[PDB]
Curated annotation (Swiss-Prot), chain A:
Domain free text: The MIDAS-like motif in the VWFA domain binds divalent metal cations and is required to promote trafficking of the alpha-1 (CACNA1) subunit to the plasma membrane by an integrin-like switch.
Residues of the full protein shown: 242 to 337 of 1106
Record's subcellular location: Membrane; Cell membrane
Glycosylation sites: 85
Subunit architecture: Dimer formed of alpha-2-1 and delta-1 chains; disulfide-linked. Voltage-dependent calcium channels are multisubunit complexes, consisting of alpha-1 (CACNA1), alpha-2 (CACNA2D), beta (CACNB) and delta (CACNA2D) subunits in a 1:1:1:1 ratio.
Protein name: Voltage-dependent calcium channel subunit alpha-2/delta-1
UniProtKB/Swiss-Prot annotation, chain B:
Assembly and interaction partners: Component of a calcium channel complex consisting of a pore-forming alpha subunit (CACNA1S) and the ancillary subunits CACNB1 or CACNB2, CACNG1 and CACNA2D1. The channel complex contains alpha, beta, gamma and delta subunits in a 1:1:1:1 ratio, i.e. it contains either CACNB1 or CACNB2. CACNA1S channel activity is modulated by the auxiliary subunits (CACNB1 or CACNB2, CACNG1 and CACNA2D1). Interacts with DYSF and JSRP1. Interacts with RYR1. Interacts with STAC, STAC2 and STAC3 (via their SH3 domains). Interaction with STAC3 promotes expression at the cell membrane.
Name of the protein: Voltage-dependent L-type calcium channel subunit alpha-1S
Family membership: Belongs to the calcium channel alpha-1 subunit (TC 1.A.1.11) family. CACNA1S subfamily.
Transmembrane segments: 3-21
Residues of the full protein shown: 50 to 97 of 1873
Residues in the signal sequence: none
Intervals, Extracellular compartment: 22-36
Reported tissue expression: Detected in skeletal muscle T-tubules (at protein level).
Protein source organism: Oryctolagus cuniculus (Rabbit)
Function: Pore-forming, alpha-1S subunit of the voltage-gated calcium channel that gives rise to L-type calcium currents in skeletal muscle. Calcium channels containing the alpha-1S subunit play an important role in excitation-contraction coupling in skeletal muscle via their interaction with RYR1, which triggers Ca(2+) release from the sarcplasmic reticulum and ultimately results in muscle contraction. Long-lasting (L-type) calcium channels belong to the 'high-voltage activated' (HVA) group.
Glycosylated residue positions: 30
PTM field: Phosphorylated. Phosphorylation by PKA activates the calcium channel. Both the minor and major forms are phosphorylated in vitro by PKA.
Compartment(s) of residence: Cell membrane, Sarcolemma, T-tubule
Length: 96, 48
């Protein structure tokens, strides 16, 4: 996870995290999902672009961003603070 | 007074089995099967 390693081990990315916040994930798996998305954002650099979306019978952005943003320390702070505010309710729909 | 014993006993038995295969999901999720066993409740609430 050291950035020199992640830097020399693959090319840049255009990652889009897609959290599932349907009702059935509530409980344990939801908090594991929050911690996991944070620990995944921590494997990105300033060369990569990211955004966290979220779907439960309707897909929307987890935050204020609405497209791919540059994954620097400020943007990743925004996306972590937005992922921590996540709640689970609804029916699942993977197509949307 | 026909053999309606069996026709209502088996209907209640199938109602029980359809009650037991239902799977309760949290926070108001659902799956395809549960949405079918409700389209089967108007068939068990008509016969009865
Ligand atoms: C002597 C006793 C020894 C232990 C026996 C324990 C009781 C057995 C009951 C049947 C059973 O073990 O499985 C229930 C099963 C429903 O469960 P299933 O559809 O497999 O759910 C998916 C799995 N996650 O299959 C069923 O849906 C059965 C549902 C029971 C409803 C029928 C009961 C009606 C009244 C009595 C007649 C029986």
């Amino acid at each position: 996870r050291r950035p020199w390693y992640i830097q020399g081990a693959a090319s840049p990315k255009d990652m889009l995290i897609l959290v599932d916040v349907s009702g059935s994930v509530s409980g344990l798996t939801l908090k594991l999902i929050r911690t996991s998305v944070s620990e995944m954002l921590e494997t990105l650099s300033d060369d990569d672009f990211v955004n966290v979306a979220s779907f439960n019978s309707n897909a929307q952005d987890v935050s204020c961003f609405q497209h791919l943003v540059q994954a620097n320390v400020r943007n990743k702070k925004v996306l972590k603070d937005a992922v921590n505010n996540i709640t689970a309710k609804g029916i699942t729909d993977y197509k949307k | 007074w026909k053999p309606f014993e069996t026709i209502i006993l088996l209907t209640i038995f199938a109602n029980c089995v359809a009650l037991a295969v239902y799977l309760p999901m949290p926070e108001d999720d659902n799956n395809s099967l549960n949405l079918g066993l409700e389209k089967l409740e108007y068939f068990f609430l008509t016969v009865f």
